[PDB]
Ligand binder design. Structure first.
Ligand code: HEM
Ligand SMILES: O=N[O-]
Ligand SMILES: O=N[O-]
Ligand SMILES: O=N[O-]
Ligand SMILES: O=N[O-]
Ligand SMILES: O=N[O-]
Ligand SMILES: O=N[O-]
Ligand SMILES: O=N[O-]
Length: 153
């Protein structure tokens, strides 16, 4: 359980993300695909992309990044009261896309990397700790849902 102050650190950096969600989404998905290339193979619309430049030029990848961060943002703004938001997301990621918990770990690492890079004004150690806690809670609750749904994450 996060404290109110931890949530405030999370939502303060998120507010900066929201200044340019598309840009942040591109940076995060690209960081994930560079750092863990195997994760790209899960995306049929753009698994063929070969380079970061191609990735930056991809309107579809940009749209996907927006879709991811907007969904995540809505979850974060619930401050742990996110059961309703998690149901469809867990179902799709378990059953349609087959995304292991390990890969949700990888994207969380990518989120933290980009925020650290872009937002040192809002992402010092305490803020990064709070964001890590929020993302650990997300993964914990999604992992419990995966189990309910029948998916070894
Ligand atoms: C913060 C973590 C994540 C969030 C909030 C998120 C959110 C979403 C959302 C909202 C969609 C569209 C609706 C849906 O299908 O549920 C989506 C689609 C998808 N997500 Fe994620 N996602 C996350 C992580 C991942 C990761 C790590 C992968 C793969 C390594 C992944 C793979 C997919 C795929 C393959 C689709 C379908 C893309 C397509 O249209 O072809 N997601 N995701
Ligand atoms: O009051 N912040 O943990
Ligand atoms: O885009 N990775 O540093
Ligand atoms: O495409 N925004 O959720
Ligand atoms: O707590 N949401 O599964
Ligand atoms: O449950 N959505 O593919
Ligand atoms: O993408 N994590 O460093
Ligand atoms: O990031 N220094 O607290």
């Amino acid at each position: 359980v996060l404290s109110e102050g931890e949530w405030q650190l999370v939502l303060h950096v998120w507010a900066k993300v929201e200044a340019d969600v598309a840009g942040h989404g591109q940076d995060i998905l690209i960081r994930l695909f560079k750092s863990h290339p195997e994760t790209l193979e899960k995306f049929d619309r753009f698994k063929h992309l070969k380079t970061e430049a191609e990735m930056k030029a991809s309107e579809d990848l940009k749209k996907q990044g927006v879709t991811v961060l907007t969904a995540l943002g809505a979850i974060l703004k619930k401050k742990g009261h996110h059961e309703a938001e998690l149901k469809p997301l867990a179902q799709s990621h378990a059953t349609k896309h087959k995304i292991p918990i390990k890969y949700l770990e990888f994207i969380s690492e990518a989120i933290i990397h980009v925020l650290h890079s872009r937002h040192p004004g809002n992402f010092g150690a305490d803020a990064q700790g709070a964001m890590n806690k929020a993302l650990e809670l997300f993964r914990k609750d999604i992992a419990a849902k995966y189990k309910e749904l029948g998916y070894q994450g």
